Amino acid sequence: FVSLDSPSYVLYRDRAEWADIDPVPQNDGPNPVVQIIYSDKFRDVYDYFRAVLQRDERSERAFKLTRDAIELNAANYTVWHFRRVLLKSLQKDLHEEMNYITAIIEEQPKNYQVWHHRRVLVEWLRDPSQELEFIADILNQDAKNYHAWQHRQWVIQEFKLWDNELQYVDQLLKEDVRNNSVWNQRYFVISNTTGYNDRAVLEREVQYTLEMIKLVPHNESAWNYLKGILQDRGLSKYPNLLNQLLDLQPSHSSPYLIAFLVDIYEDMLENQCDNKEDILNKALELCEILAKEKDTIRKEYWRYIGRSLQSKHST
Amino acid sequence: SSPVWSEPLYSLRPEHARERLQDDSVETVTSIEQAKVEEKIQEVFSSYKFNHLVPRLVLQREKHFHYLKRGLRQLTDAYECLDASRPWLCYWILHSLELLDEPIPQIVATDVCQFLELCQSPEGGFGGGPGQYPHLAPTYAAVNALCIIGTEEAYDIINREKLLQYLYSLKQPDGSFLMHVGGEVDVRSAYCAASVASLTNIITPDLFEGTAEWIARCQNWEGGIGGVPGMEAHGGYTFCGLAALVILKRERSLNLKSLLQWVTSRQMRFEGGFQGRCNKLVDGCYSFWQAGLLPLLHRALHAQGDPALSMSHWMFHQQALQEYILMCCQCPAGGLLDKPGKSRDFYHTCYCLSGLSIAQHFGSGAMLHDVVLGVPENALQPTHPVYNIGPDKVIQATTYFLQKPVPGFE
Numbered sequence: 001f002v003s004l005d006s007p008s009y010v011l012y013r014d015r016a017e018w019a020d021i022d023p024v025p026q027n028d029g030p031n032p033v034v035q036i037i038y039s040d041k042f043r044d045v046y047d048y049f050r051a052v053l054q055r056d057e058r059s060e061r062a063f064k065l066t067r068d069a070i071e072l073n074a075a076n077y078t079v080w081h082f083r084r085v086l087l088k089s090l091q092k093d094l095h096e097e098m099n100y101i102t103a104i105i106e107e108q109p110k111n112y113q114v115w116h117h118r119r120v121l122v123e124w125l126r127d128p129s130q131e132l133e134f135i136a137d138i139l140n141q142d143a144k145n146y147h148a149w150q151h152r153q154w155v156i157q158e159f160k161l162w163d164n165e166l167q168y169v170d171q172l173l174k175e176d177v178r179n180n181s182v183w184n185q186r187y188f189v190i191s192n193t194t195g196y197n198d199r200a201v202l203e204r205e206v207q208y209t210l211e212m213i214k215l216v217p218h219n220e221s222a223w224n225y226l227k228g229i230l231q232d233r234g235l236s237k238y239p240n241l242l243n244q245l246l247d248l249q250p251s252h253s254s255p256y257l258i259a260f261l262v263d264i265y266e267d268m269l270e271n272q273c274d275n276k277e278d279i280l281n282k283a284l285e286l287c288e289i290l291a292k293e294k295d296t297i298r299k300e301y302w303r304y305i306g307r308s309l310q311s312k313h314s315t
Numbered sequence: 316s317s318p319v320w321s322e323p324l325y326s327l328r329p330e331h332a333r334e335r336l337q338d339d340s341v342e343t344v345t346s347i348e349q350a351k352v353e354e355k356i357q358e359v360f361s362s363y364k365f366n367h368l369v370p371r372l373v374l375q376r377e378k379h380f381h382y383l384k385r386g387l388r389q390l391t392d393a394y395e396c397l398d399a400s401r402p403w404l405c406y407w408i409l410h411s412l413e414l415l416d417e418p419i420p421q422i423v424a425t426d427v428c429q430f431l432e433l434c435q436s437p438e439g440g441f442g443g444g445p446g447q448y449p450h451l452a453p454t455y456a457a458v459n460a461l462c463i464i465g466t467e468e469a470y471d472i473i474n475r476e477k478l479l480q481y482l483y484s485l486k487q488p489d490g491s492f493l494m495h496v497g498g499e500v501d502v503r504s505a506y507c508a509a510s511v512a513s514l515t516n517i518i519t520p521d522l523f524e525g526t527a528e529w530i531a532r533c534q535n536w537e538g539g540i541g542g543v544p545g546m547e548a549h550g551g552y553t554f555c556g557l558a559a560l561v562i563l564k565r566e567r568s569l570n571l572k573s574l575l576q577w578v579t580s581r582q583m584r585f586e587g588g589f590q591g592r593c594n595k596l597v598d599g600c601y602s603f604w605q606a607g608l609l610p611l612l613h614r615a616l617h618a619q620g621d622p623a624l625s626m627s628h629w630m631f632h633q634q635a636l637q638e639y640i641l642m643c644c645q646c647p648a649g650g651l652l653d654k655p656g657k658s659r660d661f662y663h664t665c666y667c668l669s670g671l672s673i674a675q676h677f678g679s680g681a682m683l684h685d686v687v688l689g690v691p692e693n694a695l696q697p698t699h700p701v702y703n704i705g706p707d708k709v710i711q712a713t714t715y716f717l718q719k720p721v722p723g724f725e
């Protein structure tokens with residue numbers, strides 16, 4: 001009706017249509033702590049909100065009041081919950097409510113309550129039709145918004161909207177190949193569709209990732225995805241990979257490559273490789289290089305890995 | 316060696332420059348943002364070096380104390396956005412004071428107890444302010460604040476019978492918890508529930524059925540833990556997940572190898588602080604959420620008889636973290652912050668100090684080893700890595716409540 005910052009906004013205490021209900025002040029006790037000295041506008045809205053909540057007044061006036069309470073503090077989960085009680089009680093048009101939450105999220109996309117509210121609406125409507133495009137708009141403004149990604153995963157899984165997501169992932173990796181949220185989405189799509197047990201799919205993914213590593217060798221996310229898609233079967237189960245990285249070592253001896261070699265050696269030793277003593281010596285040499293020169297921030301981790309290898313494989 | 320008035324720093328070594336970002340000549344939004352932070356931080360590090368003279372670093376305790384003491388009474392309307400988070404303000408402030416070894420006056424303590432009583436819901440749990448619905452986040456904060464106070468008055472505030480009923484009212488068949496009635500599920504709720512239920516001795520056999528398994532489903536391909544199954548690994552949710560599993564004695568439900576490798580990877584080679592997820596920016600609050608995972612992992616691995624564990628250090632760079640916090644995260648007006656250029660706030664004050672204390676204090680069994688960078692006065696009180704209140708406060712509360720029955724359950 002009238003927005004909180006509109007020139008014609010009137011305090012609730014001055015509204016004739018609210019005259020019949022007494023506001024309920026917040027009791028902070030006689031000796032308050034962490035006491036927020038609210039603006040007049042804030043206190044006015046929340047005094048009337050406390051009144052409608054106390055009375056459990058399920059009215060159109062209470063519904064409009066929640067919009068103002070939300071503008072004042074969109075992290076107020078009590079107000080959001082009451083608004084949903086009213087949406088149901090008053091049989092409000094949920095498509096109009098979807099337009100409202102769309103606007104609100106655009107303004108405040110880093111907020112748990114607004115995303116949860118949207119999910120409840122989509123659940124109630126069983127209508128995911130605006131979701132992928134809307135989320136894509138939020139992600140256009142911040143490609144790593146955690147709530148946006150989480151909501152996208154929910155919509156896709158709940159409504160089985162898998163068909164175009166790998167293409168979307170590819171587009172965002174083209175824009176920023178360092179976007180870890182997108183590598184995570186890549187795993188989410190593949191594991192839930194084809195799986196990684198299909199050896200043709202796994203090969204496609206290993207090639208794709210190695211190509212990304214060649215383009216941007218110090219991008220941690222691609223290294224992490226490579227390990228992530230191979231680790232459960234065991235890095236040592238992929239003998240060609242070791243050779244390929246060993247061929248890359250001299251010219252591209254990054255801490256990521258060197259760490260990946262240690263990870264391979266660790267698994268090899270766990271699986272009774274031939275030339276155990278040789279593999280152990282190479283692993284310990286690399287742990288020392290990482291601890292002392294190439295990855296010194298992780299000195300304590302690399303020293304632990306060295307001791308761990310010796311406790312398991314020395315003889 | 317060195318005179319007492321100069322202390323060489325890791326971030327000031329000549330070879331530290333080699334740790335700057337290598338963008339491979341491929342610029343993306345990520346690398347551009349990382350480089351901007353690194354450039355600012357290098358300027359900061361340099362301001363602490365005077366050729367071979369490197370004065371000891373100083374935690375500005377008195378400035379932090381005054382800032383905190385003022386936040387405990389009245390706040391401006393700038394804090395309206397935290398009107399549904401008032402027990403958090405109590406917890407963040409009281410815990411910061413506790414770390415700084417600043418006594419809580421009797422009158423302040425009573426006033427805090429009274430206010431938290433007003434935030435307690437008749438249905439059980441605490442809301443974000445008086446008359447608000449209860450929510451597991453301010454429930455966690457209020458319980459922690461009461462245990463920091465640690466008086467019988469504080470303990471007795473908690474309605475334990477209703478608290479247990481409230482937790483039941485949020486519990487889902489898949490092991491997860493809602494954050495509040497009609498609210499969202501994520502791993503924060505499992506931790507909030509496990510924390511308050513263990514401190515107050517209200518755990519039933521039933522309460523956490525399936526919860527360990529659900530948390531394990533949130534561990535992802537990266538090795539850290541996301542907010543819900545499928546989601547990107549994040550330090551905040553990883554802390555919650557592992558701490559909840561430690562309380563439940565179910566840490567082995569996770570792959571601790573991939574978790575350890577992931578968290579240690581989150582320490583930034585140049586900045587010395589931690590990022591919250593791969594390829595994002597350093598932030599002082601991760602000094603707690605990320606680095607606090609290392610004492611938890613140490614305990615977990617030690618329980619398994621791991622013969623390779625250190626007897627003196629956590630598995631992260633304790634010195635570099637202390638350097639990041641002391642040089643980059645202090646506001647000269649008091650309070651601490653995310654990174655240079657950001658505004659102070661009570662949340663970053665709480666977690667930067669908590670992370671500093673973790674970095675200063677190693678303990679395992681009978682072995683204790685402190686590394687207090689800078690002037691000796693920088694030493695903070697220790698914090699418990701599960702609950703993030705003083706270990707003394709944990710013991711006192713748990714002992715008190717263990718004397719009461721689990722409500723309606725024999």
Ligand SMILES: COC(=O)CN([C@H]1Cc2cc(-c3ccccc3)ccc2N(Cc2cncn2C)C1)S(=O)(=O)c1cn(C)cn1
Nearest residue numbers: 110111112113394397403551598600653659660661662663
């Ligand atoms: C115990 O852990 C927390 O409370 C983290 N929370 C916020 C808290 C927060 C508080 C303040 C603050 C505190 C006191 C006075 C003024 C401000 C500032 C920022 C806060 N959070 C955002 C944050 C912290 N570090 C990076 N970022 C983006 C993260 S949070 O409520 O879980 C959160 C809410 N959202 C939407 C995302 N995180």
Ligand SMILES: CC(C)=CCC/C(C)=C/CC/C(C)=C/CONC(=O)CP(=O)(O)O
Nearest residue numbers: 146452503549551552591592595596598604
């Ligand atoms: C007991 C509680 C309430 C713990 C909170 C645990 C945390 C800190 C969880 C993180 C939740 C979250 C929504 C993270 C996403 O933050 N988004 C960012 O952009 C910050 P960054 O870039 O550092 O990920």
Ligand SMILES: OC[C@H]1O[C@@](CO)(O[C@H]2O[C@H](CO)[C@@H](O)[C@H](O)[C@H]2O)[C@@H](O)[C@@H]1O
Nearest residue numbers: 232531532534535536537538569570573
């Ligand atoms: O970090 C890998 C480790 O996490 C677990 C769960 O504890 O599984 C996660 O990671 C897998 C990929 O490695 C995903 O398939 C799975 O969905 C996810 O929960 C362990 O199984 C795995 O070793």
Ligand SMILES: [Zn+2]
Nearest residue numbers: 598599600653
């Ligand atoms: Zn932060």
